[PDB]
């Protein structure tokens, strides 16, 4: 006989779809219909799943929109190279397809590059940006985390890199768990694996690290990233920066610097964390975003 009697693993959000440049994109859409929407953008190799435990904190007061990038999550998977340029084109068109006007961004990893680049080009529409573990220029390999130098150098080759990421699914099975301090459960791993069970679908997982602005290459990405970082230092847009210890892309020392150099910026320590801060302390991140959103309406 039986009797009846943690960081959430479920994804209790109804699928929403919109046609974007002839392809179907999936997104979470919850919360009130009026007011300024909060747009959550994930990076590599995740999906809207990464926001699952953060969104419920914001949804009571704001619309939350969390798309899966083209070729990822539940969005369609056209035969693209999935360059950053492709993601930009699709994300621009997604935002237009939903008829969004002003927005608040919550962005992470490659999602931050998309968010920052979009904000730079749409200064009058951005009402706030929350960000963490974001893409910035990496002048030399010495400025890349030591533990991942050899690995990412290998990733950034055609034959070896594709064998690792596409054939062996290393970014999902290897790199992903290394971006979280706590161990991911099998249920969580399965939600992350889901979009990429078919090896040929793993193209964006390989192109993304090959797009990273490292040692001047790719030059186009480096220029673009420098441009939005320059814009960011000059914009009065409200900013909220989450960081963890030791972090990965944004070490604590770097978070302290940005908190001062970026105008109108608040920085929040999430405790232990690497790249996927959302997976180590989603309640703090969600709570702080919800409260920060409230202060955006306070004049002073
Ligand atoms: C230094 C390794 O850092 C990472 C770790 C340890 C884990 C994950 C998931 C991601 C990254 C990095 N971000 C990333 N790489 N290519 N596209 N986005
Ligand atoms: Mn179509
Ligand atoms: Mn192809
Ligand atoms: Na399993
Ligand atoms: Na999934």
Residue from 135, 174, 179 to probe ligand 1 pocket by mutation (most atoms less than 8 Å from CB) = 179
> Three-state SS for 211?
helix
Residue from 110, 156, 178, 244 to probe ligand 1 pocket by mutation (most atoms less than 8 Å from CB) = 178
Say if CB 20 and CB 78 are below 8 A apart: no
How far, rounded to the nearest angstrom, does the alpha carbon of residue 136 sit from its chain's CA centroid? Answer: 13
> Three-state SS for 140?
coil
Helices 84-97/110-121 angle, 10° precision = 60
Apex CA 135: angle with CA 74 and CA 187, to 5°? 35
Give the position, in ligand 1's atom list, of the atom nearest the Cα of 110.
18
Domain with 73, as residue range(s), is 1-300
Say if CB 240 and CB 130 are below 8 A apart: yes
Say if CB 240 and CB 128 are below 8 A apart: yes
Pairing label, strands 64-67, 23-30: antiparallel
The rounded distance, in Å, linking the Cα atoms of 281 and 300 is 30
What CATH number is given to the structural domain containing 109? 3.40.50.1820
Q: How far is CA 296 from CA 34, 81, 105, 190, in A?
A: 16, 39, 13, 37
Resolution in angstrom units? 1.9
The rounded distance, in Å, linking the Cα atoms of 107 and 115 is 6
How many Å lie between the centroid of ligand 2 and the Cα of residue 81?
18
The rounded distance, in Å, linking the Cα atoms of 176 and 41 is 17
Instruction: Indicate if ligand 1 lies below 6 Å from the C-beta of 153.
Output: no
Q: Which of 87, 45, 25 has the alpha carbon at shortest distance from 205?
A: 45
How many domains would you assign to the chain?
A: 1
Instruction: Indicate if ligand 1 lies below 6 Å from the C-beta of 47.
Output: no
How many Å lie between the centroid of ligand 5 and the Cα of residue 119?
28
Q: How many CA atoms lie within 13 A of 86 on its CB side?
A: 17
Instruction: Indicate if ligand 1 lies below 6 Å from the C-beta of 209.
Output: yes
Instruction: Indicate if ligand 1 lies below 6 Å from the C-beta of 179.
Output: yes
Say if CB 92 and CB 26 are below 8 A apart: no
Q: Cα-flanking dihedrals φ and ψ of residue 245, to 5°? A: -115, 125
Say if CB 104 and CB 38 are below 8 A apart: yes
Q: Which of 88, 137, 95, 134 has the alpha carbon at shortest distance from 265?
A: 134
How many Å lie between the centroid of ligand 5 and the Cα of residue 195?
6
Q: Cα-flanking dihedrals φ and ψ of residue 240, to 5°? A: -130, 115
Six-digit token string for 56: 């419920």
What number of other Cβ atoms are within 10 A of residue 219's Cβ? 9
Q: How was this structure determined?
A: X-ray
For residue 230, what are the contacts with CB-CB under 8 A and spacing of at least 6? none
């Amino acid at each position: 006989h039986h009797h009846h009697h943690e960081i959430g693993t479920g994804f209790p959000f109804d699928p929403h779809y919109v046609e974007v440049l002839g392809e179907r994109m999936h997104y979470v859409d919850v919360g009130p219909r009026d007011g300024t929407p909060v747009l959550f953008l994930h990076g590599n190799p995740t999906s809207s799943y990464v926001w699952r435990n953060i969104i419920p904190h914001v949804a009571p007061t704001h619309r939350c929109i969390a798309p899966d990038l083209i070729g990822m999550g539940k969005s369609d998977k056209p035969d693209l190279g999935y360059f950053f340029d492709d993601h930009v084109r699709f994300m621009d068109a997604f935002i237009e397809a939903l008829g969004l006007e002003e927005v608040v961004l919550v962005i992470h990893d490659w999602g931050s590059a998309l968010g920052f680049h979009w904000a730079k080009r749409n200064p009058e529409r951005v009402k706030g940006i929350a960000f963490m573990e974001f893409i910035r220029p990496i002048p030399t390999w010495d400025e890349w985390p030591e533990f991942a130098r050899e690995t990412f150098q290998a990733f950034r080759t055609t034959d070896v890199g594709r064998k690792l990421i596409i054939d062996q699914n290393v970014f999902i099975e290897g790199t992903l768990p290394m971006g979280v301090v706590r161990p991911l459960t099998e249920v969580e791993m399965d939600h992350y694996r889901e979009p990429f069970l078919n090896p040929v679908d793993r193209e964006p997982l390989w192109r993304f690290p090959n797009e990273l602005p490292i040692a001047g290459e790719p030059a186009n990405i480096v220029a673009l990233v420098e441009e939005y970082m320059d814009w960011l230092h000059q914009s009065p847009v409200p900013k909220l920066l989450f960081w963890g210890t030791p972090g990965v892309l944004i070490p604590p020392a770097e978070a302290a610097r940005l908190a001062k150099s970026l105008p109108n910026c608040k920085a929040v320590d999430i405790g232990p964390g690497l790249n996927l801060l959302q997976e180590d302390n989603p309640d703090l991140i969600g709570s702080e975003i919800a409260r920060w959103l409230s202060t955006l309406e306070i004049s002073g």
